[PDB]
């Protein structure tokens, strides 16, 4: 049981550290990039609509 918990603790810590380390920045950058592209497209549409 001690070898089983010591064997599972490294996989849990490595999976939590890898997922927590690699999880946030891709969608965190892509959401702001897509929102900035949508806002730039909306401002480019309104600027052409005002003329």
């Amino acid at each position: 049981a001690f070898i089983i918990l010591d064997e599972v603790i490294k996989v849990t810590n490595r999976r939590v550290n890898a997922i927590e380390h690699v999880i946030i920045p891709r969608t965190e950058n892509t959401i702001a990039y897509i929102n900035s592209e949508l806002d730039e497209l909306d401002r480019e549409e309104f600027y052409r609509l005002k003329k």
Binding site: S36, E40, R43, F46, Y47
Partner: protein
């Protein structure tokens, strides 16, 4: 002068433009509503209105005020609440019986119900005068006058007529200037545009060693008069308690409170809570209200008063800096003025930008931080002045990554964070060294270290000790306390006592809202000497329980020394902290042997 040609939306168009500039503000119609001509297109002028346009028909008269939209500088400014457009709420409460500005009602920019006594300065008949020179003195309070009567900037001449001493109103004249014949009449109140910066003698770097009344904030970073610093907020997450505690606990000559886009609940609590507080400047005459200037504009007001509120407060702080005194300008926040600029730009017809912000917000954000600063006072006297700008930041687009806080963080040279758990813990402010930085601590530690400072060595070892204890707290929490070094427990124990005694402050007494620099330097030097003596005693062979149990009343006595009076050594030095080094050296020598 002009006639109303057409009205479309919230902006009214007035024709008959035969010389009216696009910078002067005028009142359209018989109601005298607030408005300003932002642009002109041919004979018809386009004027933006910051109020309801109900009751305005085609053919109404338009009369200009004869000058741009700015604030008036005169005596009797303390203990009064006005708006950004020179609208006093006290006259509206007396006449209209309301707080908000009503439609079709106009009030004066200066209160004509209170008069002050004007005294002659060092200017005689036929003496030379210039812009910024001290022409006399005007009483602004019942205890001490701080309103210095000076001439307008960018002007000069000879004083042909000087009035005598006595009480007079702001509308009446007291002096006359002769420059190329009959130049004009001079009074107590002067005009100054809010969109134009006040002139000065010469600008310099912020190196004035002035304190703001923050023990943990002054201990973590050296406060200077004339610098630029931004503080993050959450719309009432602890910024109002830090601004009210910083303004009330401050010991400056003047205080500038600017409410641009507040909800209105903190404005009444700051005005009613300001007179109940006790100032630390040797006086009890309503010093919290009389010693500070209150300009509060709520969310139910026009965008011109909220946008021009920071310009009027920065213009009043520039006039107080030009008078020869250091004033602290605390404005919350720039997000309401940045949203009001995009709201006025969308209604006026301006094009959009990135993140929904206008293109003028980048130049106005740099001009707002460049308007305040420490330099030489303008005029023949050459006095020393300073203006500290404290602007709050909040989200206005749906997140904290907007261009206002991003451009304000890059433009500013000092950052002060604010943790929500520390604000919930009754600690104000809850900023840490790992979430804040400042590059102006070299000049403040150079001059304040030049007088009698020890802030540099205790500040660097205190920031490194807090950064080492903050990193050691996660290793002590995750790994445990049965496998770490003994120096990490002494560093975390000294960081917990220094963070509890320094960061823990909510205005419980008069000694907790105003601490001297020598008491904070001796308090940090006692903790640094206790941590260094504990690490040196533990390095030579010793137990942690022998030193912690060996300290005893010294550790609890060192934390309870902030509730007493600071007059222990001569008038401001702590005498108990000086004698603690002998007991710490005797305990360190006894713990080693």
């Amino acid at each position: 002068y002009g006639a109303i040609y057409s009205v479309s939306g919230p902006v009214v168009i007035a024709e008959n433009m035969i010389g009216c500039a696009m910078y002067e503000l005028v009142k359209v119609g018989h109601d005298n509503l607030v408005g300003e001509v932002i642009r002109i297109d041919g004979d018809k002028a386009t004027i933006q209105v910051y109020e309801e346009t109900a009751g305005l028909t085609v053919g109404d008269p338009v009369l200009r005020t004869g000058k741009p939209l700015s604030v008036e500088l005169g005596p009797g400014l303390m203990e009064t609440i006005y708006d950004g457009i020179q609208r006093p709420l006290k006259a509206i409460k007396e006449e209209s019986q309301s707080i908000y500005i009503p439609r079709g009602i106009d009030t004066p920019a200066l209160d004509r119900t209170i008069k002050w006594q004007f005294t002659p300065g060092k200017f005689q008949v036929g003496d030379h005068i210039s812009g910024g020179d001290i022409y006399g003195s005007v009483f602004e309070n019942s205890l001490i006058s701080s309103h210095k009567i000076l001439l307008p900037p960018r002007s000069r001449g000879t004083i042909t007529w000087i009035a005598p001493a006595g009480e007079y109103t702001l509308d009446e004249k007291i002096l006359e200037v002769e420059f190329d014949g009959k130049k004009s009449d001079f009074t107590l109140y002067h005009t100054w545009p809010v969109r134009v910066p006040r002139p000065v003698t010469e600008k310099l770097s912020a190196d004035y060693p002035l304190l703001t009344g923050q023990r943990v904030l002054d201990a973590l970073f050296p406060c200077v008069q004339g610098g630029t610093t931004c503080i993050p907020g959450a719309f009432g997450c602890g910024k109002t308690v830090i601004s009210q505690s910083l303004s009330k606990y401050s010991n400056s000559d003047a205080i500038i409170y600017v409410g641009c886009g507040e909800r209105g609940n903190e404005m009444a609590e700051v005005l009613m809570e300001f007179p109940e507080l006790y100032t630390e400047m040797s006086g009890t005459k309503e010093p919290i209200m009389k010693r500070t200037t209150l300009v509060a504009n709520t969310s139910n007001m026009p965008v011109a008063a909220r946008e021009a509120s920071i310009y009027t407060g920065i213009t009043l702080a520039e006039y107080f800096r030009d008078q020869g005194k250091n004033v602290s300008m605390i404005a919350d926040s720039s997000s309401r003025w940045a949203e009001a600029l995009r709201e006025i730009s969308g209604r006026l017809g301006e094009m959009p930008a990135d993140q929904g912000f206008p293109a003028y917000l980048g130049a106005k954000l740099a001009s707002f931080y460049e308007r305040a600063g420490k330099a030489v006072a303008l005029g023949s006297p050459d006095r020393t002045g300073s203006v500290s700008i404290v602007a709050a930041v909040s989200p206005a687009g749906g997140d904290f990554s907007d261009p206002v806080t991003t451009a304000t963080l890059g433009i500013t040279q000092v950052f002060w964070g604010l943790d929500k758990k520390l604000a919930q813990r009754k600690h104000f402010p809850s900023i840490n060294t790992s979430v804040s930085y400042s590059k102006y601590t070299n000049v403040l530690n150079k001059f304040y270290d030049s007088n009698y400072p020890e802030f540099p060595v205790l500040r660097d070892r205190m920031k490194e000790i807090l950064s080492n204890a903050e990193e050691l707290e996660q290793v002590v929490q995750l790994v445990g306390k049965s496998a770490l070094s003994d120096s990490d427990k002494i560093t975390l124990d000294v960081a917990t006592l220094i963070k509890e005694d320094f960061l823990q402050q909510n205005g419980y007494s008069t000694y907790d809202a105003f601490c001297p620099i020598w008491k904070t330097f001796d308090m940090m030097r006692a903790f640094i000497s206790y941590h260094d003596e504990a690490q040196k005693a533990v390095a030579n062979g010793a137990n942690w329980s022998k030193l912690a149990d060996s300290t005893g009343d010294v550790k609890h006595a060192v934390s309870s020394s902030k509730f007493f009076e600071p007059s222990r050594g001569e008038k401001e030095v702590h005498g108990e902290f000086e004698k603690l080094l002998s007991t710490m050296q005797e305990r360190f020598a006894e713990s080693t042997d």
